[model samples]
Target chain A: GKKIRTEEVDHLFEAILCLKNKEECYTFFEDVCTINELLSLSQRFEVAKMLTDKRTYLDISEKTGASTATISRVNRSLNYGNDGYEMVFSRMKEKE
Target chain B: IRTEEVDHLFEAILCLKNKEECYTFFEDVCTINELLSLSQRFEVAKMLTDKRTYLDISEKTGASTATISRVNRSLNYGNDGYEMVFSRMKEKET
Candidate 1:
């Protein structure tokens, strides 16, 4: 949960590829990542999603098990952080 | 799904890089009951898609008559939600 240190980069990329199957990805994460790690990653992504929906912070926190702090972090990213979330989400939306 | 929901389900499905993570993600996204309902609906859809009668789908999906009737109508007249998802799913499948 601490900065996703450079050392874990490979594992993370590998993780991304496995997720293509969808079902297999969830099973793998639940079995392997520490709960904290999973929660941390899931929370960040969830926050980015909630922000895209333009939901209030309080509501997003309530449904996503994310804290106000996490929501703020995602908001920051949405406004300024390299547009990673928006880029990916745009492609996903176009796909849908 | 919304952006966050997308992040969760997609990540949950894909982030499980290891063998152990694989099973856990599967469980998190879909419990047996949820799966059953989804599967049943899918079966009903296939029947309807194939132009099967309501009675026939009821027999196959073991879905209630009401459910069959609903599926029947949904195919004919619900909003485009079904077709949108179906097309996306099919595209993804291929």
Candidate 2:
């Protein structure tokens, strides 16, 4: 599309893609981020994606660290922000 | 260049009364034209950082050829804000 610019994001998922073992994953991230906060943020994005795919708020909150408030906020923006999530998610889906 | 410079730059930015005042103060530090040009460039950088293209970015951001070209060049050749911000944010990510 003439109206869409995209960047080639290298290392976009190195942590997820690599780290052959759970021990390696723990070591890599421990060097990189605080584990507790990392888990929370991971859960938040997981909830965001799940919500985008029409998951219920209660289930998302239970599985992910997203509070109902965070889920609601992500929901609002997912539907409202110039289709930003749609664009990113569609591209991601295409990759899969 | 140095930590001290970063500190002073941030301090000056913090002294601004509001967003408008911040722009005004930045204009004083850098020429108004240059500042606006750079800011416009930053907007382009941000869009490119978000993975938008020249045409899409120009359309969405209303940035001109010269500005988009400049920003694109920076995206390719500049301080690597994309990687820097992405890595930093990712490291902050869980």
Candidate 3:
């Protein structure tokens, strides 16, 4: 996805793939990304999951502490932004 | 657990079983501009660790001096976050 992918970005992505387990993932990401950055990314993903599960906007906001606009934006992505979230989020559920 | 939201998010990321799985997950997690800044700052970190000059780094990565310094803050001070992953990536290459 040229939306963000690049030669340098490839290294960062590889950095993640190199991680072997949960602790490694936590340590690597916490160091490579800021506390807020990691937390924020996770929060947005959580919003996406909630939205896909057919959770209400109010429910997502309360559960994730995300704003209405953030939820709306995630909804927009799920509906229109390339189905990236839908693909991953669906596989995530099926994996369980 | 460090509360449910972050806990669940972490769990979701941890669930990925392979490289393709990772791409889709992060493709959703990361925004376009967010990914741009993240990738640029990361290159800045790599160059800095190699002792590259700020001017060269700026010109090459197209990151501003301000953004470079912000990247430097995390590289030098925050946590060994960058160093840890950098080493891992290096290890993988060998």
Candidate 4:
């Protein structure tokens, strides 16, 4: 828990929250994350949702095009770590 | 990606000209659903940082109270990603 999250990261986190709109986010994220970085982060987040839905690891890997290792990592985080994915996933269900 | 790669990505974003270019780049690299999910989070973060109650944010953004609470928690304790972004956007508005 007391790992990489540091005070030095404040500016980066707040900068993202500061973006005004989806369009601005595109620019911000696109600049801040690479094609691979963006794709992997989004996929990992999606993988978290699928796992919460009780989907099998194979199902998640197939749908997300993520490796089994990737899916497992996300699963671990969703269940035991920061709970960021769980928070977003719960909200997404409300919209559905 | 590693920390260095992440820094490069942010650097690339600063090079963008306008929103339209962002869209073009995003469309080429990201899926629609992926973008939508991220958009939802951003909306949630904005509402949370504005000090909206979870109930009100849930109503407006259709996010669950749990989701709003999580964002609130992140704003408070997480890496301060939301705070950094929120402050910059506010500066732009002023």
Top DockQ model: 3
In terms of lDDT, the poorest run of 10 residues in model 2 chain B is B1-10
* lDDT by residue for model 3 (A6-94), tens: 67777767766666666666765665567788878778888888887899989999988899988887787777766767765566678
The per-model DockQ list reads 0.04, 0.03, 0.49, 0.06
Which tens-of-lDDT digit does each residue in B1-94 have in candidate 2? 1233233233333333333343333322332343344345545766777878788988966788877776566567554543444455466575
Q: Find the candidate with the highest lDDT and give its number.
A: 3
DockQ of 1: 0.04
> Chain A TM-score, candidate 3?
0.84
lDDT of 1 by residue, A45-91 (tens): 77777788999989898988888877776687678655556555565
Instruction: Name the docking class for model 3.
Output: acceptable
Q: Write the per-residue lDDT of candidate 4 for residues A1-96, one digit (tens) a residue.
A: 222223323233345434554456554565333467576765765676678789988888887788987777666666666454444444445646
Local lDDT at B21 for model 4: 42
lDDT, model 4, position B89: 59
TM-score of chain A of each: 0.72, 0.54, 0.84, 0.85
Pairwise DockQ winner, candidates 1 and 2: 1
lDDT of each: 0.54, 0.48, 0.75, 0.56
Q: What share of the true interface contacts does each candidate keep?
A: 0.08, 0.00, 0.47, 0.07
Q: Is candidate 1 or candidate 4 better by TM-score?
A: 4
Q: Candidate 1 at A26: error in angstroms?
A: 1.6
